[model samples]
Target: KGEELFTGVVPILVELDGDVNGHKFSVRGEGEGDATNGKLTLKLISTTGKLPVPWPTLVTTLLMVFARYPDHMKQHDFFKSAMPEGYVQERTISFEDDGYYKTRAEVKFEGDTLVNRIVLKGIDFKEDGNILGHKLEYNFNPHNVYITADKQKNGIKANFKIRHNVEDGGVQLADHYQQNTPIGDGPVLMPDNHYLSYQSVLSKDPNEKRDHMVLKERVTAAGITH
Candidate 1:
């Protein structure tokens, strides 16, 4: 089974090259049957041979690449209830730098589209062993996720801005999503005016926030009940 999947569909990349602040790199990976089965291995090739990268910088770069580099940056539902009629697959990976940094990755797949996510925990740089306050957490989310526009004019205008205070463990964010069609008044999908969007901060900070926002988008006119 594993062998068939690996050898079934060959590896391919939509764009073989990428640029990071003038530094150049290339990526390549393999998949099978719309990439829903078998594992996809990616190799990151850096073209900047003369530039010396620091440890922290290298680690951050690798994490970003692994976490967000799904095939063509396309995403599809991988959950059992949400998955379309057909095969579905997912993969998870973990990495560590011996006592320096530790990270975990999870990718969900459906047909040819997929979403890659990663979390970095206990990232410490000091090699001499004092990892007191060095523990830090970071989340690399699904990349290249944004609304599309029509040919005639801009279909939507949305901006999300938020401010947070670490000491208070609190954050305030505002989302503005409105239509920008040339007609000035097109079929409005969201409420035409601004509304007070209040939310609560639960025991888990970022996770709770993410869950609330995701569920809010899925709620319908009938409303979501317990």
Candidate 2:
């Protein structure tokens, strides 16, 4: 029997509310898992730096494709068509590895008190685009006093919170629970430095490149005129 508790990296957690309920967690694995695998409460963390790079060209390309697609068919189909061989659809709710891409946990739920929740575990996409076996889980339970998550066999536990947010929408009550389904498309995070590198490349314009042009453009776009 396995009695010894193996040592591993401690997950980072932050509680955001004075009521001491809601929280966010981030977990990073060394070469032990993927290059970067963690969770972000989209509402809490700014996705601004997540991708680290923005591919305006790719974004524009995808937008154009969507605009020209059929009524019933959309980007999903176009994406699959352009994907390299060996890609497959994620069965409604079954989890498995294909190539270098793999998925971990897929937990989501809906209720009157809370509306949407999606948590996914990301892993390193292998040489051919497969994910190595490393798990990261997040829990946002409202009924309970604490949030909890675990990595089976690997012995990783993640416990956090579900707090309410106030906006023009008013007090938004949070919900807690995972869908208990295996994600078919793997985790949302793509392979390797996929997104970041892609964005960096797209922003390059040798003919008219400026050292800090992108930053200036972003700040100016956020000004009053925006």
Candidate 3:
């Protein structure tokens, strides 16, 4: 029937490891059915130092949240559906130098449409109130993902290794896969930019169904990242 299109983004396989304040965390998971839906498992691995009871719990929760980074992109619509009419709330926290962060959440119905917004305000020792960051708005629409494949899909096989680093605040995601087919070594590379290009081409194509079905098979077989 070939009917599902633009429903959701497929998740990429992830293997992440990090060290923070003497605590270490690791995560490994892969997408199922689609990118937005998947199961992830995180391990505390080891703790070299000790933290207070609540602090350790807080740290553990934060790492768990980070492990779901790839899935959040699919939850764009949850805010609108979950919030009811005319709701507002605010909370505050204080930090060093008298610096503090405040969070505000509000929701309302615009005629038949739902509107959700969040704002974060900050203050310093100077007693000056300034907005630090804000979520601004929330939408429920899912992201788009595409794939292309041919009948020769099962002809490919490979192994993958991924690494993620947090020090220095610089971001980088890398995947290295080696081919091990019986006939010969089939070297292949499918990066994030390639996916973007595929989406771009599909946008203006007249025969969407034909092209998408073919591409879908190839992408799944190659194990492209989100």
Candidate 4:
């Protein structure tokens, strides 16, 4: 049976890397996801604009709380059900819509290889104070994320490189197999927008008043040149 169960809008940062057998491969990107109108999608626009990248199941599940696992067009129970009358109190960091919550997260979904570590704020939802995947499933050993503050998702700098080998010598040395785990998040891209957008990330002022957005500032103190 198909069902639309929940709704969410959250920004995300995702990085992935690994080398199986003798060959090597790595991937990293920035994006966001939202579930609305009974549909949900995540894309990596920092590199491949508007194209859906291939990430694992777990990554999407954790990042896009409201969306269901296999059928994103459907929805999940966790987003709305897990914390019915939730309780994880954190200091509020406000953004537009007056969003609130300050979070520092280091997520390692190993059994696979990826490292997600950062801080952010400003997600829109219907509820009181603050809650994320972390708290909703608290003491349950299950895992997940949230955002808003002086620095949006991009207050921290993220730089990555993809190096391709020029030598086309031999194909026999390469090895490919499924380690079998789950994977990867997003920003809006098109003219019409929602909570998180690449434009929102790249085009913000010193105010940086939007969620999933970033702004850079340099302050010079007299004599201390910092």
Q: Candidate 3 lDDT, tens digit per residue, 78-102?
A: 1112222333433343432234334
lDDT, model 4, position 213: 21
Candidate 3 lands at a TM-score of 0.21
- By TM-score: ranked, best first: 4, 1, 3, 2
Model 1 Cα lDDT, one tens digit per residue, 93-208: 11222122222333333344333333333332234222222222221111121233333442323233322222234322212222223222323222122211222121223532
TM values, all candidates: 0.22, 0.18, 0.21, 0.24
lDDT of 4 by residue, 1-226 (tens): 1112233533445543322222222334443344342132333222222111112111221132323333321222222222222111222333222233233334332332222433333345224311211112101111112111112321111111111111232111111111111112222111111121111112323452222222211111111111
| Candidate 1 clashes between residue pairs 3 or more apart in a chain or in different chains | none
Per-residue accuracy of model 2 over 58-100 as CA lDDT, tens digit each: 1111100011122232211221122111121111111133221
Best by TM-score: 4
Per-prediction count of colliding residue pairs? 0, 18, 14, 15
lDDT agreement of model 2 with the native: 0.18
Which segments of candidate 2 are over 4 A away from where they belong? 1-3, 6-48, 51-103, 106-161, 167-170, 179-226
Candidate 4 TM-score, C-alpha based: 0.24
Candidate 2 at 71: error in angstroms? 60
Query: Candidate 1 — which residues are off by over 4 angstroms?
Result: 1-10, 32-43, 47-139, 142-146, 153-226
